């Protein structure tokens, strides 16, 4: 009835205009000397979530007229969805337990979002995982609408929520719970938009595990001492922060050595390389680069701030921030190159590669659990504050840290898939 290239071009233009309309509303909102208020942005996003709910309802009632590494993706989606639903339950509980002096749009939004989350998970659980069976104008509209709805939810969570949060026991528990649960909501929308992008575009092992266990035990130790000296008063806090930075430096140096050793083992073994012209390589490559973007931006902001301070011959320079930031950039570059080469290719080289893969696997688990459980000292750095401002540095960190969490989860799954080869 209707051609497919025109369907995909119309859907691309529709979704692009949807994104640019949301960006226009956010630009009108940020210039506070104007009539556009935050409830208007929440009403716009609420209407988008309702349209996606209606589409998913029509899709499931159409499919129920017919009858007949996925587990890593489903587990990640379900865990992040449960944390997002817990945060929405806290928001609804606050809305039914407070002095009713805020607008109705802040009550309808956490309810619809919750329904949106549930339905979206159900859809992404059941009607997508190798059960597609057709691609027409209806599914292309739905997938593109879902992509840009989740991107606008990501932008709203990144900017217009923690510039209100990061700027009576029930209020303390509410604020503490929001502080711990926020990056999992942001990463949830990152994860959902990444999956929808994928489906849119397509349609003797001793020393390794032992070093990994040392990495894990050391991360839990640093996490525990930081949370202890964060929960109580400010004494011995800066020792915990310096412990975080020295641990990060040593660990990323060891990960650079491991990934480089893997790359040199690959270089010494010559192969008829790179003849297949694999588009799946391009897909996983763009996922790893898009995940690496946030932490690369954070690290170059720290490098620029430290070099600008060093240009004054100032005190409190200390060389550890430069080493940490540059080693973080270098570590993600070498690890991305190692994973991408590993996924698309005697016995002693198998034992070396498996020990390297288990070491990097447990190191990425460690570097995931350290900010996810609430360490994150970078928000209180006095150097990048007063250079970029508190609002710009906070927004840069809100972009960087959930993308860093998604990067570590994707790298854990990818290194596990590399390991069983």
Ligand X SMILES: CC(C)CCC[C@@H](C)[C@H]1CC[C@H]2[C@@H]3CC=C4C[C@@H](O)CC[C@]4(C)[C@H]3CC[C@]12C
Ligand Y SMILES: CC(C)CCC[C@@H](C)[C@H]1CC[C@H]2[C@@H]3CC=C4C[C@@H](OC(=O)CCC(=O)O)CC[C@]4(C)[C@H]3CC[C@]12C
Residues that bind its own copies (CB under 8 A): 3-6, 9-10, 12-13, 16-17, 20-21, 23-25, 27-28, 30-31, 33-36, 273-274, 281, 285, 289, 292-293, 296-297, 300-301, 303-305, 308-309, 311-312, 329, 333, 336-337, 340-341, 344, 386-389, 392, 396
DSSP 64: T
Q: How far is the CB of 220 from ligand X (least distance, A)?
A: 10
Per CB under 6 A, does 97 bind ligand Y?
A: no
3-state secondary structure 269-316: CCCCCCCCCCHHHHHHHHHHHHHHHHHHHHHHHHHHHHHHHHCCCCCC
Q: How far is the CB of 406 from its own copies (least distance, A)?
A: 17
Q: How many residues bind ligand X (CB under 6 A)?
A: 12
DSSP 161: T
State the Cα–Cα distance between residues 320 and 333, nearest whole angstrom: 20
Q: How far apart are the first and last CA of the chain?
A: 46
State the Cα–Cα distance between residues 44 and 322, nearest whole angstrom: 42
Cα 319–Cα 320–Cα 322 angle in degrees, nearest 5: 70
Q: Which of 224, 392 has the CB closer to its own copies?
A: 392
Per CB under 6 A, does 42 bind ligand X?
A: no
Binding string to ligand X for residues 329 to 368, with x set by CB under 6 A, is what? ------------------------------------x--x
Residue 409 contact, options ligand Y, ligand X, its own copies, none, Cβ 5-8 Å cut-off depending on partner type: ligand X
Stretch that binds ligand X, among 34-42, 273-281, 326-334, 409-417 (CB under 6 A): 409-417
Cα atoms found within 13 Å of the Cα of residue 212, Cβ hemisphere only: 19
Q: Which among 290, 293, 327, 319 has a CA at the least distance from the CA of 396?
A: 293
Residue 410 contact, options ligand X, its own copies, ligand Y, none, Cβ 5-8 Å cut-off depending on partner type: ligand X
Count the neighbouring beta carbons within 10 Å of the beta carbon of residue 297. 15
Per CB under 6 A, does 34 bind ligand Y?
A: no
Q: Which residues bind ligand X (CB under 6 A)?
A: 72-73, 75-76, 79, 365, 368-369, 409-410, 412-413
């Amino acid at each position: 009835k209707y051609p497919q290239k025109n369907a995909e071009l119309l859907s691309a233009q529709y979704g692009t205009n949807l994104l640019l309309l949301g960006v226009s509303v956010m630009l009108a909102l940020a210039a506070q000397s104007g009539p556009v208020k935050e409830e208007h942005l929440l009403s716009f996003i609420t209407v988008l979530m309702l349209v996606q709910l209606v589409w998913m309802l029509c899709y499931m009632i159409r499919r129920e007229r017919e009858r007949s590494g996925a587990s890593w993706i489903r587990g990640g989606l379900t865990m992040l969805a449960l944390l997002s639903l817990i945060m929405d339950a806290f928001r609804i509980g606050y809305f039914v337990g407070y002095h009713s002096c805020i607008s109705a749009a802040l009550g309808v939004y956490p309810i619809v979002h919750a329904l949106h989350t549930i339905s979206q998970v159900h859809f992404l659980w059941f009607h997508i995982k190798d059960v597609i069976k057709k691609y027409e104008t209806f599914e292309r509209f739905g997938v593109i609408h879902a992509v840009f709805t989740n991107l606008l939810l990501w932008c709203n969570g990144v900017m217009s929520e923690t510039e209100h949060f990061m700027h009576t026991s029930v209020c303390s528990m509410f604020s503490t719970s929001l502080y711990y649960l926020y990056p999992f909501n942001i990463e949830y929308h990152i994860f959902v938009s990444a999956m929808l992008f994928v489906m849119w575009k397509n349609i003797g092992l001793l020393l390794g595990p032992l070093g990994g266990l040392v990495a894990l035990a050391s991360s839990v130790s640093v996490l525990v001492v930081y949370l202890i000296h964060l929960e109580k008063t400010e004494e011995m806090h800066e020792a915990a922060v310096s412990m975080f930075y020295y641990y990060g430096v040593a660990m990323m140096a060891c990960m650079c050595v491991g990934s480089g050793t893997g790359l040199l083992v690959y270089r010494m073994e010559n192969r008829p390389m790179d003849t297949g012209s694999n588009p799946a390589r391009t897909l996983d490559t763009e996922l790893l680069l898009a995940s690496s973007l946030g932490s690369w931006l954070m690290s170059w902001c720290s490098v620029v701030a430290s070099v600008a301070e060093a240009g004054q011959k100032s005190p409190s320079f200390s060389w550890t921030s430069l080493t940490y930031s540059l080693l973080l950039v270098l570590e993600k570059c070498i690890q991305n190159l190692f994973i991408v080469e590993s996924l698309y290719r005697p016995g002693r080289k198998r034992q070396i590669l498996k020990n390297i893969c288990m070491f990097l696997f447990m190191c990425n688990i460690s570097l995931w659990i350290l900010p996810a459980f609430g360490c994150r000292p970078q928000y209180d750095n006095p150097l990048e504050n007063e250079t970029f401002g508190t609002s710009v540095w906070t927004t840069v960190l809100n972009v960087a840290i959930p993308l860093n969490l998604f990067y570590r989860m994707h790298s854990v799954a990818s290194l596990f898939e590399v390991f069983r080869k």
